[PDB]
Subunit: 264 residues, 5 copies
């Protein structure tokens, strides 16, 4: 098959090259460029088949259907990568502003490690002991702090006190002025050798400027987390479309091997 | 319709792909690249129709008119994205320097949440109570501070005092030297245990350098606001042209379905 | 005119699209990309006219002359944008190193607000009063400080003292040690309660490191001014060529409307 | 050989140009752009050979196979450069997340200076003296610190103490409170002239903010090391494929010079 | 000459456009993009000449030789710009790691101002006085500091002391403890009014963190010097190839004007 080895083989190769675009990180600035070349290569080989196809009036050759399916996968791949830029900015005038989908996306992003589907939800250790039970710590519906861990749960309790123990220690523990744990024990006359405890009020003003500089850097780290939160929502879309297009790509290959004996 | 399923179908798909360019944020550096490919793909199919069209002398086929309208939408899409770069820089030698349009653009940008048109101006809660009334706070024509809020109104009063209460507290409240609210009560002999209140004049000099570093970082945050202000003015242009070109795109599709029975 | 409404029309549109390149800021990194597409689109339509033109031996059709003029404007537009990168770097091994043209460019850049040509030099307020007179302040040929203003003249006197009043106050004003203006009045025994005026020599060392960090940030702001100075010299080149190419573009359009009745 | 000097010559030149892509650093953002042009040029020359090849039904000319090998080398070069972006991000949702290959890659990266293969493992100084012997310092399997050196071994012991001598000096050396080496010799009454050793508790708070700013900058240097660690793993892939494709390129060239006498 | 004014003219124009690539700074990120378009435009015109050239078996027209020289100049221009990226990173796994050429390149870079060739070495002031003589200061082969100047020689002596006078003042000048030049004159009892000279040991710890932050910024300035050092080595390559290709371009133009009367 001269036409089956120079025109059908590139059809699956072009679609297969688009699958790599769905396995790349959302932070890649050159990802959109790669997807453009895939669509460009399809048009180069599409013109050759146009001349072969007879110029009829209402009889559309079945070869055009195969190219349409391939173009949709390649065309949608570029659009999918373009949508990634919206998440990185989410501008009020344009982007993924509606939050009704962000909550759903966040749950899907956290399902990558433990998918709710039977593929991973059921294929995992299971027992009737306390390892799979529930308690007050696990159920945070009543404003219960999550179990401390190294994944970021400790930081949410300490750093993100939210007018809590970190900022305002409402519980009267009696440690600041009732214990010698690096603090005076109700010692109201603890002077700095006859001078006020603070050697210079100017130091407090310097701390405000220094703290603001440190606070601005802290916001930069938090800004990256916000960008990372949108980054995760951008990679799942590529992964979600990778599986959806995988079935379509397989179907197209099957159709070619199944329709050739009847037409070709 | 052999030519209708291979040449007319991409005509509306190419114009539809340009609509996504109008829904992207102005901060996307690769937005211009996406629009270039849309125009490039139109030229590939335009050459094929040229051979089909008879080489006449003064009889212009109606098919060329459709391509002109399609190219205008695609061509203007790239131009619109190019204009976005002007707002991000607004260089004195080139860009949107004239401010007579900036004021109008600012009002339009703020209308996204509450459009002045009947679509959103009239479709909203309305009552004759004080919720829809006016007072001194709402009317800021007489240099009246706006109602404090979390949207940035509090910062304009406190941080942006403009030689006001923050910088020069003209009102004689008698708190700095007439109250014990973290300040002496007319205590001119409040010495630091016999020493001057300031332990070292060098600390003040350090504060000036530290404050300048913090001030420079503050200007960077304000610079982003200026860029954000121009960013909003850039996204509205894309959104404004999206609706304008939507009607034209629909008209072109209607014309094809209405002119084919008479010509095709 | 089948070929006049399909081939001649894009000829002036392609040249008009290059005019937008000359109205963009010099800081746009994607400006060069836009100019490339303009030249690429001209080649697509150029090949079509090649077949139409008879393959003669020494008879060059007049249509080729129009394409040469159009390509020069489009070709020079890309080169002009390429030259912009040289100003942003001005590397010793390559760029606009010779300063004999920088001085002339600086004067031209400052003429944008008040052009020396009669278009703006003569069209402006004029009177015989002191508003248009000259004095010592205006004439800075004898090392006279310019009149203080908010455009940056005050900063050149204060911040850029250059071993002047800011750094070395040569005039014996008798204020530091002869007035109570935030300084001792010749009080050589003004001790810090029996201790040296400086509470710790280590604070001076910290100031040097803090000052260096602040000084480095100051140089970054000055570096932007140097880039801005080259940025202005880059935008004038685009603006200068915009007017020059505007006349050529008009001439080409006139020639087509004037040569067609004799040839076409 | 009219077709050998116009079509066969560029075949090896196109593949040779792809070798430079594998010799570029992984931090180059324009590396992917260079590889795109190489594939684009191959397609331009491939269309010319299509017309020459007779349009048979099932007799595929052997020239097609030669182009397939060249396309694989050029096609895979772009894919290899695309994979580099995955290492720079290694996002959890996409990239080189599995660490089972990272350990192997790290060993390969360190083999560049001293390859385990006989080419460099055997071609090097060898002796039976202590220079090639092993001891406790060389064998770090029992948590033995590596021999201090300037390659980064000293920093791993001092800076990266990991609750060791740098942080918690468990060994009772008796130097802090038992020696005059810039510390008191069990002097519990060493007061600051009657005042506490610390002149102001506010200084400790300032150090925490200053230390955090310095610590954040330290993490930036460590972040570059992590990026450099992935950078090394990205360059070896280019180098690893450079040798593999070199043999294939040589084979393709030999085939042309060996098959031409039988076919051409 | 119908083909001489339509096909030969762009041949020299395409090669001339590549000369601008060799006059651009090495820091231009879009320099590689410009060179790609030059090669792309050559292929458009190359295909047209292919049809004109008769399809012979072993008779290669001389027109192909002219295109080969043009393609080499244009092809090498892109490669030269690609090599620039290698110098900016010089990764151990890829780049200009061998230093045997860096020393030679450094000497060539410094020859731009005063070329060793007779063009500039001989065309310059020359006299037998001490201006062109040599002394100990000029000859630094015996670890002699170079004459201090504003070109960067003073900083190498003071800032880059290398355990010298800046760090360890070995010469016993007797100024720190033997002169009143801002230091005690052997005054071992110079206390801070009865207190230790240092008011707080915590200030020393703060200086270490502040110094590290300043030191890191100093390394960034030194990092740019390393990049600038590689930048100079990258611009000379472009300049070196500019002169080499200038002769070849002139030869190609001469050949066309010399071979046309015999062939054309
Ligand atoms: C695995 C294929 C994918 C697409 C891979 O292709 C690559 C790598 C990338 C993909 C992963 C590239 C590809 C070559 C393939 C490897 C294949 C071959 C070298 C040859 O074919 C094989 C398989 C083929 O049977 C599928 C088989 O025919 C038999 C069995 C069939 O019954 C199942 C039967 O009907 C048939 C009658 O007899 C055949 C004998 O032998 C070779 C024939 C294919 C060459 C294809 C290239 C030649 O010019 C083309 C052009 O330049 C283009 C644009 C892409 C090239 C390409 O795409 O080249 C190209 O189309 O690898
Ligand atoms: C919603 C359509 C848009 C264009 C979508 O297109 C895509 C996705 C993107 C758009 C959202 C891509 C498109 C396919 C379409 C889906 C359509 C089909 C698979 C087929 O058509 C449908 C609809 C069509 O009736 C509009 C209908 O005809 C009937 C009803 C008509 O009366 C209303 C009547 O007159 C007519 C006589 O009988 C038909 C039977 O069935 C299929 C025929 C279309 C194939 C088109 C592709 C084939 O090679 C082309 C080439 O490669 C190119 C450059 C783009 C491709 C494409 O553009 O492919 C391509 O042109 O989806
Ligand atoms: C204002 C024109 C500029 C170029 C603008 O063009 C755009 C916007 C961009 C520019 C600012 C794009 C352009 C359409 C125009 C608007 C014009 C029309 C829709 C029609 O034309 C008008 C004007 C024309 O008279 C100049 C007039 O003819 C009359 C008067 C003449 O005497 C002065 C006389 O001699 C003549 C015999 O009868 C005509 C009847 O009606 C429409 C007919 C033009 C179609 C455009 C062409 C179709 O495919 C061409 C090309 O393959 C491509 C890539 C794009 C098209 C285009 O270029 O589309 C294209 O070239 O707007
Ligand atoms: C200085 C030339 C360089 C290439 C410059 O070209 C540009 C600017 C860039 C370069 C610096 C661009 C160029 C135009 C030139 C300026 C030249 C003209 C407007 C005309 O030509 C002149 C010179 C020519 O004699 C060299 C002369 O012929 C005479 C003397 C010859 O004896 C020496 C003799 O043999 C001959 C028989 O009669 C001629 C009469 O008059 C104009 C006629 C040239 C048209 C240009 C061509 C038209 O489409 C071509 C190509 O498809 C394309 C893409 C661009 C065009 C171009 O290349 O346009 C193109 O190739 O400027
Ligand atoms: C080292 C070659 C590589 C490809 C280098 O090519 C470059 C530089 C880049 C590579 C490193 C580019 C190349 C030219 C070559 C230098 C070669 C020549 C100027 C000529 O050829 C040589 C070698 C050739 O023998 C291999 C030899 O034939 C002999 C010996 C053969 O027996 C071994 C025997 O069978 C045969 C019958 O008689 C020949 C006489 O003399 C010249 C003839 C080739 C020119 C080719 C160019 C001309 O238009 C072409 C077009 O534009 C294209 C797309 C690429 C060009 C190119 O590719 O140009 C081009 O195809 O250098």
């Amino acid at each position: 098959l001269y036409y089956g080895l120079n025109l059908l083989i590139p059809c699956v190769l072009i679609s297969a090259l688009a699958l790599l675009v769905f396995l790349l990180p959302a932070d890649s600035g050159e990802k959109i460029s790669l997807g453009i070349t895939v669509l460009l290569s399809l048009t180069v080989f599409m013109l050759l088949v146009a001349e072969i196809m007879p110029s009829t009036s209402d009889s559309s050759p079945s070869i055009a259907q195969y190219f349409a399916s391939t173009m949709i996968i390649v065309g949608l791949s570029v659009v999918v990568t373009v949508i990634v830029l919206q998440y990185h900015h989410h501008d009020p005038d344009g982007g993924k502003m509606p939050k009704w989908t962000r909550v759903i996306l966040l749950n899907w992003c956290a399902w990558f490690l433990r998918m709710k589907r039977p593929g991973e939800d059921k294929v995992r250790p299971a027992c009737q002991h306390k390892q799979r039970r529930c308690s007050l710590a696990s159920v945070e519906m009543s404003a219960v702090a999550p179990p401390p861990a190294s994944n970021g749960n400790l930081l949410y309790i300490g750093f993100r006190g939210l007018d809590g123990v970190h900022c305002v220690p409402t519980p009267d523990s009696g440690v600041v002025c009732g214990r010698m744990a690096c603090s005076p024990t109700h010692d109201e006359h603890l002077l700095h050798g006859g001078q006020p405890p603070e050697g210079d009020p100017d130091l407090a003003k310097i701390l405000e400027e220094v703290r603001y500089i440190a606070n601005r850097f802290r916001c930069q780290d938090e800004s990256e987390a916000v960008c990372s939160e949108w980054k995760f929502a951008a990679c799942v879309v590529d992964r979600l479309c990778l599986m959806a297009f995988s079935v379509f790509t397989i179907i197209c290959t099957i159709g070619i091997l199944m329709s050739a004996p009847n037409f070709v």
